[PDB]
């Protein structure tokens, strides 16, 4: 829990890259998911005018 | 031996409910992460800057590097970088610039 | 409150959401079992004192 | 009317105690009423800002307006003002600190039309300011480098906070 | 023309309000203005600080090197008889050097018995850091001192404020017990340390040597730094989280932009774990024993 | 004597300021000297000067900022004179161009100042671990494709010659010496405390003493700009940023018995006669060959 | 409005009431003349209630100016530096009073919309939530297609 402020700040608001195999899956249901993780709504800290969004891979 | 939820990961929870009905207590302290799941820290540092014959030639040699671009490629090239689109990057109005408060209020 | 302690204590959240799968779970036991008899642990209704 | 700008040069400042950096002249000056429209004044003396006089001379010189004449002399006299009568040596040495153009008084014509109509016509003045400072010109400022952007957006992520979260 | 006072004045008001806006008046001294008593004022300090003061000591304790000097060089410019009365001031030199010497003994006593982990080095900093000039100036000048104080200059620099605040200190210690006086600084300067940091007032620059050092006084052998979690390498805003480990249990852990910068963190992590300088440490105690 | 690289510089920085201190502490006061102007331009102008304080730089700046831009050196009474060279007595004072009729004056003053600007970068671009001894720069006509300095190195490094790589840094060094815009300065000094200056280099003691030795006063010339002091034969241009186009070209060995002497070449232009990029390309070859003038 | 005014976060001034409570309150001024019916209200409360407030608040220094003026003010002043203005101007004795209080218990900062209810040093006490808290490690800590 203790850590500098910067660092803190920086880990909170971090961006990550998520993996979402396509084969045989619906465009649809695919990108609800996707969607959501563009958003950034999967972050407890979400609000819409923090840049918190992450990266989608599909493939 | 049961929870609710893996304790994988965060804490290991443990849930109770207190004799005489009126209190639920919860016992979670942390889970660290274990050695056999960590990687060993990439160590990267090389210089061939070094010119043999003249050293101070090498140490300057590091000091070689800058560059000059045009608005345009530097705006893409700074939004392929951070994944944006070309838009944020150019510039504001005086009348923009203008209403920024000089001194915003600050917490913690 | 709900959601500060979601954001600033993530711990005390997992216990609150471990409490809530749980007796989501007694519930459908309960739902299932068709008989008066069992009161899960968590499903026993509290009256003031 | 306001006349202020000529004022502006009758200020005395205290003296300067020993060890305090040398305070740079200024020297205020303008003309008033010319014949100009105001706009077409603003273009020249747009152009000529942050200009070392000797630079502003020569801009002027070769230009074809109207009023590029009229700021050229406003400028010989300003110079010359710079070091008769405050004290500055090397009159090379002054640089444009301010060059604008306001309105002056405007007279009213009748202009005709036809089929017995007419405009209402304004004959048009307007007055030249210009101050000039002692030292070599102020750099003019490079666009932000890659590295200035990057920086910046860096900087901003790391501003952000939790909204409404406590 | 329209026939009335009011607007008139109503506008006077409006052009004193302008001329004060363009050119802002130098800042002058709270007892050069018009409602000013200075004896009333010495004894409401007192009764608001929940203090006993005596008022000799007190009116002592404002007292600076400098008012005097001044006010010697008024008597000396207009060829007046002073110096018996003016020389008889007492000033707060003596006060103030019991003061800080008192403050920094307490302070010292206070942080050693609440954090027994913190070596010598980092105790003095804190010391250093609560009895520091902005520290010191901001409490002082918040309590009114700046107010009551008597010197040359009225924005009273810096250094002739810490003088006066710990004047004030040493007057409290004559005038009450050691007791009173380490209850009125656990009050208004270790207060001061409320949501800070510790390696905020302590400054040291390599984390990593600092730890390898405790841990040999430990006994506890050789931080590890192995990489935790991680996202994007390859971006212009990766994020790394770097544990240490010692024997293969981990002992802290920091986020970063880079591998170095969160090794380091979690360097100042560790420390703060050894130390117990943390965030869900105790918070302090405020009460009466 | 042990001494580190910075020290050196620190020692000879230092001695230049007091003998500058010591010759603005010879001049007690604030004397007017009057200067007239001989120049084709604007004659009968008559500038009242700071003794020992005033330049003809600092007398240009009467004038207008097209002569402080345009004026490489000036010519005082008969003399060429260096633009921030503080006049002595009261005199005439005419200004040298590039562009100027009979400009060989100011060539030569050119082909100077780069010569000893390449010196620098030579002296500051080899390991500490070596040593580089500034020999002099020998004075050829211009009509020679080059401008060049005698330098001496170290016995360990005697066998190899640079590449186009090391070449292109030195050319880099000497750029980044004219990006940042250095005045050059002149002092005058007697040859007892102009020894004291360069002390370990043997070559540049020798050249002190031949040239204090034809001078009845034993008086040596010094120049400076930024950190580097050396002795030239007559003055140099005002700035560093008069150069644009500038090349170290080649270097080629040269024997004599008594030592090994690489002399480097170098070709470059000033701002106000800087050449077509083809034209540059041709001067650029011719300069690769060795140009022998000592006399 | 919210956009058009300044702003600031909840704060005390020297953390007051952490270690002990600080009446903020400094000095109170009032001037009022004898004669002006406006200032009628004004009097009364300085015959009858000054001197009781005073005992009950002596940590503030009253003064009371009988001058020929129009419109009675009164002065507050605080440990912040704080200047706020008043006007007693035709009012009760009781209206007077209940302002006096009112000025007697603020705390000095400037009123103007406060951001949020609370604040806090170390909210955070156990975590603060980052992407990676809720996450499981793998073995080796490899990536979801990395092989080893
Ligand atoms: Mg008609
Ligand atoms: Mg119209
Ligand atoms: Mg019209």
Not at chain 4, 35 to 47: C, E, G, N, P, V
Not at chain 5, 110 to 122: C, I, K, M, V, Y
Not at chain 7, 68 to 84: F, H, Q, S, T
Request: net charge positive.
């Amino acid at each position: 829990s203790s850590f500098s402020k910067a660092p803190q700040q920086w880990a909170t608001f971090a961006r990550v890259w998520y993996l979402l195999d396509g084969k045989m899956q619906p465009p649809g249901k695919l990108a609800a998911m996707a969607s959501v993780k563009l958003q950034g709504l999967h972050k407890p800290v979400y609000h819409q005018l923090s840049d918190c969004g992450d990266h989608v891979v599909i493939m | 031996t049961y929870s609710s939820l893996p304790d994988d990961y965060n804490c290991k929870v443990e849930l109770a409910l207190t004799s005489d009905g009126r209190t639920i207590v919860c016992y979670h302290p942390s889970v660290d992460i274990p050695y056999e799941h960590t990687k060993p820290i990439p160590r990267p540092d090389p210089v061939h800057n070094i010119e043999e014959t003249h050293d101070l030639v090498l140490k300057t040699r590091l000091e070689e590097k800058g560059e000059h671009l045009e608005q345009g490629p530097m705006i893409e090239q700074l939004s392929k970088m951070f994944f944006t689109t070309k838009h944020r990057w150019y510039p504001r109005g005086q009348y923009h610039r203008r209403r920024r408060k000089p001194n915003p209020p600050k917490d913690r | 409150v709900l959601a500060d302690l979601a954001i600033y204590e993530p711990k005390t959240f997992k216990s609150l959401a471990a409490l809530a799968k749980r007796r989501r779970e007694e519930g459908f036991a309960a739902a299932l079992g068709d008989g008066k008899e069992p009161d899960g642990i968590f499903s026993r209704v509290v009256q003031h004192r | 009317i306001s006349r202020k700008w000529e004022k502006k040069n009758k200020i005395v400042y205290p003296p300067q105690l020993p060890g305090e950096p040398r305070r740079p002249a200024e020297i205020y000056h303008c003309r008033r009423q010319i014949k100009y429209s105001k706009d077409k004044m603003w273009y020249l003396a747009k152009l000529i800002r942050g200009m070392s006089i000797d630079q502003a001379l020569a801009q002027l010189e070769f230009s074809d307006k109207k009023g590029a004449q009229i700021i050229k002399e406003v400028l010989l006299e300003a110079q010359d003002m710079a070091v008769r009568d405050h004290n500055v040596e090397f009159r090379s040495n002054l640089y444009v600190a301010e060059s604008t153009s306001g309105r002056g008084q405007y007279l009213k014509r009748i202009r005709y039309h036809g089929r017995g109509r007419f405009g209402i016509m304004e004959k048009v003045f307007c007055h030249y300011f210009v101050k000039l400072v002692e030292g070599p010109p102020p750099p003019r400022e490079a666009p932000k480098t890659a590295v200035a952007h990057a920086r910046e957006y860096i900087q901003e992520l790391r501003n952000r906070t939790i909204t409404h979260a406590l | 023309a329209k026939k009335g006072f009011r607007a008139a004045y109503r506008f006077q008001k409006e052009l004193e309000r302008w001329r004060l806006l363009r050119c802002p008046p130098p800042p002058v001294r709270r007892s050069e203005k018009p409602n000013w008593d200075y004896h009333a004022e010495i004894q409401a300090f007192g009764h608001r600080l929940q203090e006993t003061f005596s008022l000799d000591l007190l009116k002592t304790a404002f007292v600076n090197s400098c008012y005097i000097k001044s006010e010697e060089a008024k008597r000396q410019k207009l060829g007046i008889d002073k110096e018996a009365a003016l020389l008889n001031l007492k000033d707060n030199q003596e006060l103030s050097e019991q003061g800080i010497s008192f403050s920094q003994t307490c302070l010292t006593q206070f942080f050693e018995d609440a954090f027994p982990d913190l070596p010598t080095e980092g105790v003095t900093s804190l010391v250093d850091f609560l009895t520091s000039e902005e520290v010191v100036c901001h409490v002082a000048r918040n309590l009114a001192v700046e107010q009551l104080a008597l010197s040359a200059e009225f924005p009273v620099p810096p250094p002739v404020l810490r003088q006066t605040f710990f004047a004030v200190i040493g007057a409290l210690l004559q005038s009450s017990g050691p007791e009173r006086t380490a209850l009125f600084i656990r009050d208004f300067l270790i207060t001061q340390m409320t949501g800070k940091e510790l390696f905020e007032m302590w400054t040291i620059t390599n984390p990593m040597g600092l730890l390898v050092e405790e841990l040999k006084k430990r006994k506890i052998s050789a931080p590890e730094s192995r990489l935790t979690r991680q996202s994007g390498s390859t971006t212009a805003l990766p994020v790394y989280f770097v544990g240490l480990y010692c024997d293969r249990k981990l002992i802290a852990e920091g986020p970063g932009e880079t591998v170095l910068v969160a090794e380091e963190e979690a360097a100042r992590v560790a420390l703060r774990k050894l130390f117990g300088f943390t965030e869900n440490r105790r918070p302090w105690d405020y009460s009466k024993p | 004597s042990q001494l580190s690289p910075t020290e050196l510089i620190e020692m000879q920085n230092d001695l230049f300021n007091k003998e500058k201190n010591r010759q603005l502490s010879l001049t007690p006061r604030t004397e007017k000297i009057e200067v007239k102007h001989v120049g084709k331009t604007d004659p009968g102008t008559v500038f009242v000067m700071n003794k020992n304080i005033s330049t003809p730089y600092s007398c240009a700046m009467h004038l207008s900022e097209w002569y402080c831009r345009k004026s490489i050196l000036a010519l005082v009474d008969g003399q060429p004179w260096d633009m921030y060279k503080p006049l002595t007595k009261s005199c005439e004072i005419k200004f040298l161009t590039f562009k100027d009729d009979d400009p060989g004056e100011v060539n030569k003053a050119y082909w100077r100042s780069c010569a000893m600007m390449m010196g620098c970068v030579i002296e500051r671009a080899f390991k500490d671990e070596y040593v580089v001894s500034l020999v002099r720069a020998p004075e050829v006509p211009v009509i020679a494709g080059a401008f060049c300095y005698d330098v001496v190195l170290d016995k360990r490094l005697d066998e190899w010659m640079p590449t186009k790589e090391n070449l292109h840094s030195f050319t880099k060094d000497a750029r980044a010496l004219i990006y940042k815009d250095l005045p050059f300065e002149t002092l005058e000094v007697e040859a007892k405390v102009a020894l004291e200056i360069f002390q370990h280099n043997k070559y540049k003691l020798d050249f002190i003493e031949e040239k204090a030795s034809q001078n009845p006063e034993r008086i040596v010339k010094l120049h400076r700009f930024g950190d580097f002091i050396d002795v030239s034969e007559g003055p140099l241009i005002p700035r560093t940023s008069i150069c644009f186009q500038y090349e170290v070209s080649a270097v080629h060995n040269l024997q004599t018995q008594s030592s090994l002497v690489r002399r480097f070449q170098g070709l470059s232009l000033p701002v106000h006669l800087r050449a077509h990029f083809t034209i540059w390309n041709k001067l650029l070859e011719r300069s690769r060959k060795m140009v022998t003038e000592d006399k | 409005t919210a956009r058009g005014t300044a702003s600031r976060f909840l704060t005390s001034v020297l953390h007051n009431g952490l270690g002990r409570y600080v009446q903020q309150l400094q000095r109170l001024s009032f001037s009022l003349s004898r004669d002006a019916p406006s200032s009628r209200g004004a009097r009364e409360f300085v015959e009858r209630e000054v001197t009781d407030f005073a005992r009950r608040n002596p940590g503030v220094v009253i003064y009371v100016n009988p001058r020929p003026c129009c419109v009675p003010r009164v002065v507050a002043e605080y440990l912040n530096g704080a200047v706020r203005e008043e006007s007693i101007h035709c009012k009760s004795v009781e209206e007077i009073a209940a302002l006096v209080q009112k000025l007697a218990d603020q705390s000095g900062l400037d009123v103007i919309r406060i951001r949020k209810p609370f604040h806090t040093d170390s909210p955070s006490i156990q975590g603060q939530w980052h992407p990676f808290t809720n996450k499981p490690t793998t073995l080796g800590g490899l990536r979801p297609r990395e092989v080893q």
